[PDB]
Design a protein around this nucleic acid. Structure first.
Ligand SMILES: Nc1ncnc2c1ncn2[C@@H]1O[C@H](COP(=O)(O)OP(=O)(O)O)[C@@H](O)[C@H]1O
Lengths: 444, 97, 109, 85, 96, 96, 109, 80, 96
DNA sequence: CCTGGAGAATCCCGGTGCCGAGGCCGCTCAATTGGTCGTAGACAGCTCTAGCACCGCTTAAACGCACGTACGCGCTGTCCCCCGCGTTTTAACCGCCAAGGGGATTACTCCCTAGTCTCCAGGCACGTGTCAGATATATACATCCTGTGC
DNA sequence: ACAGGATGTATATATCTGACACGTGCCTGGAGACTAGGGAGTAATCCCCTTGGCGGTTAAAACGCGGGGGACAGCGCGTACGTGCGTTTAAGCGGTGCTAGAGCTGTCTACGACCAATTGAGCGGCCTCGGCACCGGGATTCTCCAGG
């Protein structure tokens, strides 16, 4: 009923066997008048599908009205390049910068109305609510749809208050914690169908309710490469001082406000605490790996990595853990670099390029679990270590597959440290519960 | 070459502006940190309601403003325009610290 | 039959809750016994004070070209008045600011 | 083993903020040593009020300081505050 | 649901409408007025209780309230408030 | 002999004889001490009453008295007074 | 039959009247109910404060070559102690006088 | 009666000032101090008269004066 | 002849009066002043001796405190002589 | 810049008066027993707020600097004002006496208030929508500052 | 001394938004009627304390004078502060993620305080005496002030 190959108006865009079916589904959803969620996850041309959908609407239909694509700041340049390179005819404009530049843009382009597609970040959307609502929008595209996964939030209510005809959500993993968030997404999509808060009682009804507005695909169905990854779950016991601090925090002079987060920075390394460190001098010798179980196992395991293929990518949860591992690496004088949210934005891309250089002598690369830009092509790594596990198995999976880029040839193997019989086991148990729920709901 | 105001015009304009306004002048997060640090030595592991911090900030602003008024009056008594620690200590001792 | 109840407030021509005042006096541990006319007297006094302060605040609000009374208007009304400034001398009004007051020595000449 | 410190919390209140307070008070010219004195005065005032409020909260057998506790402390000191219940 | 909380907002609004028909009031101004009424009530009642103890009585009466008002309020306000209270009590006692 | 009047005179005299065995007191000094005791008692009792009202209880207890003395008396006096009162109440409880 | 009466002052070892304090607390209308240990606590606190002030006054009177405590001695004792001075800062003592204090500027050069 | 404030004499003002701790006294201090005494006394006596009027009495008592002083924040020890 | 310097006699008087404790205003003039002030509020008023003595005590203490504050203000102005402006400044800061 | 004079203050004795300290009387309040009832302690479930470790953006506000200028401060000179002392006048102070109001106590009696039950109607929590009050721009007006001319 | 040139500030106008004012539904406390008890008003009596008056005395105040010291105005100066400007950063906002601490309605239950009647000892009032404080007096030491 629809074209099975690349249309004419997309130049040098091939639409290889997945963009074609996605675009056909999007066109069918427009014809049926129901909004949709595209959840093929990182690996498929979601941007190309949205661009080609807009090009189809502009060319085959005569409705090139007010179009808005909401993207994070880091993807603005990428989206603009895709717009200008793959559908050049659909000329578009973007909004970014300080308040005076916003005034310049609205007075020069937005208000004159010669524009067709406007691309803006979340913060600029919040700042320009009154200056954006005046246009009768036709399409509303939200990349990283899990940003609005929670109701009662400023962005969610603001995007609800917009006058729009249709909308389209882009996300990798629409379901993260519970069905309440997916209900929020569906209620935003269809304003009236899902107003309520409501193996046959479950699963089946969920699948047949979620079918009409969701898609899920796997890269390996046709890519058939990129060999799989093995996760090794290393249980590690703690040291005597770790046990002592564990008991002292558990029973209850320091600040003990959030007991769970106190036990957190304590099952990892007691030197994130105060008083565990030695006296006034800071002697970086044996006040290190030999006093924590995870650090002992890490110092046992790293030399094997050195003797083998190497290139260990390290993922952590605390920048304090990042700093202590930095001190350990400088004590061992290992080639390393540190990247986190605190790293300046320009200072991150050159670091990635240096670690991904064809001849990169750097061995240790430390990144926080969520402090990435949702991109970071770390295709040159071979070893991935998860020093900590969060409450988001989806975030853990995304951090795992961010080093699982196509370019990768050596199969990357994941490590997961767990302090047995501690709060890490609880964390992993809740993560497993959430992961099983998300899989059984979405993946099938 | 550039136009400049005399030493004292901008001060009077600021006085008019701030006596016309009603908001708070100290920063919220620094004030909260100060309050928590003070309360910690009295008793450990304390939780503060967001209204209590605002009430404390209001009282602190009012006390400091009244003290500065009386300090300025003392400085004018001493035939000066500047306020000084001598003036502050005198005002406190007269008020009955 | 049973006579239709008339509130003591409307009986005494007030706008304040005489019955609630009697309950608060009796539960306030001020004395063992409370007379009948004491809550009426107290409610009338409270109404007079409230009316005076509200009238002054409304005058200030009309002078400032706003039809709503805000704490700044309340502070302006409470100051600029000898009796009210003496009654509320040691009272801090949140979001009240201060009265415009510049000493004449500081003014340029 | 890493170390990094920012500043003291008594220095959290700033010289421009103290100048704004003095301008609202009516002060035109300010000496340079006013700021340490003002920090001392504010610290003493806060320590008194916090002591009274924490005493009230301890008597209530609670862990949370409330606006009502703060208002009661201020009223006991003789600085009745309106607008916070 | 929620626990009931009592205040003087209705009566303050009624008095405001009587004294200034076209005038509103904000929520924080209402909180200030509620605290003001509570403070004055507490002051006058405490003065009356102290008077009752001093004279070795056991009943708080209109005489005690009037004396407390004259002790608290400063002068012209006191005499106007006394006139208001006398009118109120006389109206309440005249035929009821 | 008119109606009898009470005071803390004999108790103050006993305390004086305990602390200084060879010192006497005059009538004006006794009046000053009696007024001082009355004033301290009034302050502590009023603060305890306010505490009980704030916590919505109908009793005045050792906790209310102790919190009142910690609010009123400054610092070292508060600590010593709390110690003395706790010792006395412990002996009363043990001997009852 | 009944045992001999034992005063609560003797029960707690105090010198101040627990029963009289209890009666004053009940009749003063501070609360609806009074616990048993509250009068004992209050009597102990009053006794401690009296002991402190009396020892200060007695020491001052001995320094003045006298065996009788007078309002002058009481004022000297109260105003030479920081904590008692803070407690009784707003208190006037009849026939107490003032602390001898001359500002250094007024002293001859 | 009249001309009774002038009964407060310059030597008495001087003695009070010396007990305060002053060395040199201006000539214009005296009438200012007399006015201060007048206003303070009027406040205290007005409150005491209110107390004695409530008591339905015609004699002002030391207890009434003490009650007035206490309600004005100037507690007096040694008179009842 | 024999004459002292201007200021030693004043210092001796300061020491003498700070060492003494008796009253410094004539009793009969103070009593007449009190009666004249009391005439306005009510006629045919009678007083007790203790009432007049307490009034004199409180008035003298108030004046002494005011003079201390005034001396402080005069010292702050780099002066030795006290002035009505110093009296007014002390009153204004204290809150009257 | 030391001397020595002349006042002031300090110290030791002796005599007076009175007020503190002790000893009795009588009653009124506190201690002792017994009974009860409600207030508070303890649990339980719901739900809502605070905190701790972060991240990601944005931008107002803090920070450091240069520079000239009122301003604080020290020193001087003048003058009159306040102080110190002796004289005369005045009124407080003291003691004493008389007279009468008025505070203080006691005995009766009644009316005013606590306490209860019944009914219902005002007041409170909950939604909901519309106007008054921010906010943003472009004018128009008042203030100030310096150079220019006199 | 007076113009004009730049800069802040007020005023009109249009827009938007969220909080205030109103209507609904329901429940809980106030009003009506009744009873019973004691708190307080009312009259009478006493006696204490206030007031009014007088006369002698003596300190205290009023007054005048003379002169040295402090107040006040003026001048100079060199320095700390106010003003404008570029650079850095930390506050403020918007988010996640979870768990406890207290407000809650509901509930149970038990022990601790109120209450009553009896009775006795502690405390206030009254009366009486001796030693401590006070006052007067005389000798010794201290501090200030002029002179050379
Ligand atoms: N031209 C292409 N067409 C389709 N898929 C591609 C193309 N280039 C790369 N990919 C796949 O996409 C993945 C990276 O793209 P990605 O960043 O996931 O896009 P998106 O962010 O839109 O999901 C790689 O793993 C690769 O296998």
């Amino acid at each position: 009923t629809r074209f099975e190959d690349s249309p004419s108006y997309v130049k040098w865009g091939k639409l290889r066997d997945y963009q074609v079916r996605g675009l056909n589904w999007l066109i069918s959803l427009y014809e049926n008048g129901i909004n949709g969620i595209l959840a093929d996850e990182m690996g498929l041309g979601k941007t190309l599908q949205t661009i080609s959908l807009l090009g189809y609407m502009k060319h085959y239909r005569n409705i090139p009205g007010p179009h808005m694509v909401l993207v994070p700041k880091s993807t603005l340049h990428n989206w603009m390049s895709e717009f200008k390179r793959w559908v050049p005819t659909l000329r578009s404009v973007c909004l970014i910068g300080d308040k005076e530049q916003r005034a310049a843009f609205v007075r020069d382009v937005l208000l004159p109305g010669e524009w067709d597609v406007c691309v803006t970040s979340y913060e600029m959307l919040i700042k320009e609510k009154s200056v954006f609502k005046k246009f009768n929008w036709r399409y509303l595209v939200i990349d990283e749809a899990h940003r609005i996964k929670n109701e009662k939030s400023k962005l969610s209510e603001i995007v609800r208050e917009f006058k729009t005809t249709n909308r389209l959500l882009l996300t990798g993993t629409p379901l993260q914690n519970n069905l309440h968030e997916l209900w929020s997404l569906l209620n935003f999509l269809l304003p009236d169908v899902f107003n309520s808060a409501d193996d046959q009682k479950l699963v089946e009804r969920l699948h047949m309710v979620l079918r009409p507005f969701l898609l899920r695909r796997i890269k390996a169905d046709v890519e058939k490469s990129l060999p799989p990854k093995k996760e090794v779950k290393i249980y590690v016991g703690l040291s005597k001082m770790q046990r002592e601090w564990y008991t002292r925090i558990l029973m209850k002079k320091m600040r003990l406000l959030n007991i769970l987060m106190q036990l957190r920075k304590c099952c990892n390394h007691p030197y994130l605490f105060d008083g565990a460190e030695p006296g006034p001098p800071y002697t970086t010798d044996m006040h290190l790996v030999t006093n924590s179980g995870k650090m002992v196992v890490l110092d046992k395991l790293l030399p094997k990595l050195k003797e083998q293929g190497s290139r260990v990518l390290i993922f952590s949860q605390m920048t304090r853990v990042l700093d202590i591992l930095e001190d350990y690496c400088m004590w061992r004088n290992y080639e390393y670099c540190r990247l986190d949210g605190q790293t300046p934005h320009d200072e991150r891309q050159d670091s990635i390029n240096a670690y991904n250089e064809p001849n990169s002598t750097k061995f240790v690369f430390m990144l926080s679990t969520r402090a990435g830009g949702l991109g970071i092509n770390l295709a040159t790594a071979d070893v991935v270590i998860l020093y900590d596990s969060d409450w988001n198995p989806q975030v853990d999976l995304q951090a795992m597959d961010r080093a699982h880029r196509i370019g990768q040839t050596k199969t990357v193997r994941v490590f997961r440290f767990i302090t047995d019989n501690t709060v890490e086991e609880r964390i992993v148990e809740r993560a497993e519960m959430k992961l099983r729920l998300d899989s059984i709901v979405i993946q099938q | 070459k550039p136009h400049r105001y005399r030493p004292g015009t901008v001060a009077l304009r600021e006085i008019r502006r701030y006596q016309k306004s009603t908001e708070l002048l100290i920063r919220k997060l620094p004030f909260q940190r100060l309050v928590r640090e003070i309360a910690q030595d009295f008793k450990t592991d304390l939780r503060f309601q967001s209204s209590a911090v605002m009430a404390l900030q209001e009282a602190s602003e009012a006390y400091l403003v009244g003290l500065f008024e009386d300090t300025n009056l003392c400085a004018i008594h001493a035939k000066r325009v500047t306020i000084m620690p001598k003036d502050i200590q005198l005002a406190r001792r007269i008020r009955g610290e | 039959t049973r006579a239709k109840a008339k509130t003591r407030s409307s009986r005494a021509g007030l706008q304040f809750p005489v019955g609630r005042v009697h309950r608060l006096l009796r539960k306030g541990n001020y004395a063992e016994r409370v007379g009948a006319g004491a809550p009426v007297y107290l409610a009338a006094v409270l109404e007079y004070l409230t009316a005076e302060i509200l009238e002054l605040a409304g005058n200030a609000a009309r002078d400032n070209k706003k039809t709503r009374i805000i704490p700044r208007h309340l502070q302006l009304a409470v100051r600029n008045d000898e009796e009210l400034n003496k009654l509320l001398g040691r009272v801090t009004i949140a979001q009240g600011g201060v009265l415009p007051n510049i000493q004449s020595v500081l003014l340029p000449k | 083993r890493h170390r990094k410190v920012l500043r003291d919390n008594i220095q959290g209140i700033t010289k421009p903020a103290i100048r704004r307070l003095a301008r609202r008070g009516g002060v035109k010219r300010i000496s340079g040593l006013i700021y340490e004195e003002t920090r001392g005065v504010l610290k003493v005032f806060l320590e008194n009020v916090i002591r009274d409020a924490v005493t009230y909260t301890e008597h209530a057998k609670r862990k949370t300081v409330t606006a009502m506790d703060v208002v009661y402390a201020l009223k006991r000191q003789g600085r009745t505050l309106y607008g916070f219940g | 649901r929620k626990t009931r909380k009592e205040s003087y907002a209705i009566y303050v609004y009624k008095v405001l409408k009587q004294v200034h028909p076209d005038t509103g009031i904000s929520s924080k101004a209402m909180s200030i007025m509620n605290s003001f009424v509570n403070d004055v009530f507490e002051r006058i009642a405490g003065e009356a209780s102290r008077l009752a103890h001093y004279n070795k009585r056991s009943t708080i009466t209109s005489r005690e309230i009037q004396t407390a008002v004259r002790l608290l309020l400063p002068g012209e306000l006191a005499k106007h408030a006394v006139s208001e209270g006398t009118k109120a009590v006389t109206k309440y006692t005249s035929a009821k």
